[PDB]
Amino acid sequence: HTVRAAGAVLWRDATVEVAVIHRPRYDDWSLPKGKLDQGETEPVAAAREIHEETGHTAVLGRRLGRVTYPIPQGTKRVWYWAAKSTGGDFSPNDEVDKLVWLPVDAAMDQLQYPDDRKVLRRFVKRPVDTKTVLVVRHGTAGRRSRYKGDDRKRPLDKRGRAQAEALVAQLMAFGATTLYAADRVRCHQTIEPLAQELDQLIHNEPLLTEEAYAADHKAARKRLLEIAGRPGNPVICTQGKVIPGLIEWWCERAKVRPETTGNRKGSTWVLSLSDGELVGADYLSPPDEK
């Protein structure tokens, strides 16, 4: 069998130091990680494990790949994120009796596992103090053909409503702060729950609809870059025939290679930016898939 897990390179600005945790059961030094709970997405599990094992709150940034290791029951697969500490503090807990904050070179020597050193090597390979643009395809909204009335007003269905609710924890894991939605009800409804959680208004985006994008893709590219340049971590909820065009264009321009890809309803692209440059493009499956 295969056990899905998530973890992080937790880091702080002491000047970058990384957290290394000691687990006395095994007597080893590692990166924080743990298994996904039922219904949990990898990013939400990573943030929870950071809090349970280190005592810190954090904001996830760039994805740092996956590590597979054998366990008695079969295989454990762990997706890792860079995670900047935002608060909290370490007190000993069930799994961890010691935490040390080390510069990356010293942390590399402290780690027990070759695959944790590979993760830390990926961490240092690019900027970590990043901002994040979260591009979300709206949730499930039934069929255009079975809908009577303006297609623009077609609402989320029950499943899509559930996806919208499940996206709050996932987008908050990345420190979402500002909200944008293509001019379609189904796009606004996907981030409505997040708008209530943040108490933030959704800015309507006429240029990022399928129809607008098809007629004027250059206006849409320029609008994406403008949103990306504003302070904060914006969420942009749009449509299936818009997102691949925008993501592939930006990744080809920046020479960024996405490790995963897809375009499902409810999916999220985490775009990591440093000083205006794209440095990561991480596709997350819908919260009720995978």
Ligand SMILES: Nc1nc2c(ncn2[C@@H]2O[C@H](COP(=O)(O)OP(=O)(O)O)[C@@H](O)[C@H]2O)c(=O)[nH]1
């Ligand atoms: N190769 C490898 N083994 C690990 C790692 N973490 C834990 N283990 C080993 O895998 C087994 C299960 O540990 P773990 O995955 O932490 O699960 P838990 O301790 O039951 O929560 C134990 O033998 C661990 O020593 C790792 O990063 N790599």
Ligand SMILES: [Mg+2]
């Ligand atoms: Mg283990």
